[PDB]
Amino acid sequence: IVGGYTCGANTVPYQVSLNSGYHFCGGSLINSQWVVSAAHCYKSGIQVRLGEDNINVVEGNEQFISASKSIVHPSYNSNTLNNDIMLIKLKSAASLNSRVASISLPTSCASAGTQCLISGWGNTKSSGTSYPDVLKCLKAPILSDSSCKSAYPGQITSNMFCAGYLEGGKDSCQGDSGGPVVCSGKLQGIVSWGSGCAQKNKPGVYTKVCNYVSWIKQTIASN
């Protein structure tokens, strides 16, 4: 997250870190046994880390649970990033309370102008590299589809939305991928892609979760 603020320990209780010997992607806890992330985050050998603030220090609220199964969206296209969404099932159910909690799926899509919270442990610089140890937060509005398509001609599908600032300076970044965009207490987006980070006229592009609710529910119910 570029241009954000330190969230505070366990203020974002549905945030997860995906770990394969090091943090590589974020994700969101949607119930006690399932996580949603970006398909471009796919790896074998994932451990899901819940209850994290500082990802380099054991602080006392963490739950570390291995993945038993990963399911990439059946129509994921790695060249266009269309359908950049994946589900991860945990080997055992997480223990839920105020500091580890699930986030609700949306019943409708959010409109341009809605303010949302984006969070993660990704790069905090638009030029160069600096990865934080503690979780960073950013408040950002959803942009209109027209703005979003004008910023990225020929690249925005119906499964994507833009959020952020056309002026630049504030954005998600590498390492935030897979993490949550929450608006009005519902999961509306997954950190997916962008051209660089926090560049003028190049806002973040997010997977539009409201288009996937039936797939997520059906998948959860049978696996």
Annotated active-site residue 73? The verdict is no
Catalytic residue from among 28, 40, 73, 102: 40
Query: Would you call 67 helix, strand, or coil by DSSP?
Result: strand
For residue 171, say whether it is annotated as part of any ligand binding site: yes
How many residues bind Ca ion, per CB under 5 A? 3
| 59 lies in the site for Ca ion, by CB under 5 A | yes
Rounded CA separation 140/61 (Å): 28
Sheet of 5-6: strand order equals 5-6, 136-141, 115-120, 180-183, 186-193, 204-208, 160-163
Q: Are 191 and 163 in contact (CB under 8 A)?
A: no
Annotated active-site residue 23? The verdict is no
Stretch that binds Ca ion, among 27-35, 51-59, 95-103, 142-150 (CB under 5 A): 51-59
A 10 A CB-CB count for 30 gives 21
Annotated active-site residue 40? The verdict is yes
Catalytic residue from among 84, 102, 176, 192: 84
Which residue ranges are tagged as binding site? 52, 54, 57, 62, 171-172, 174-175, 177
Residues of this chain that bind Ca ion (CB under 5 A) = 52, 54, 59
Catalytically active residues are: 40, 84, 177
Annotated binding site for Ca(2+): 52, 54, 57, 62
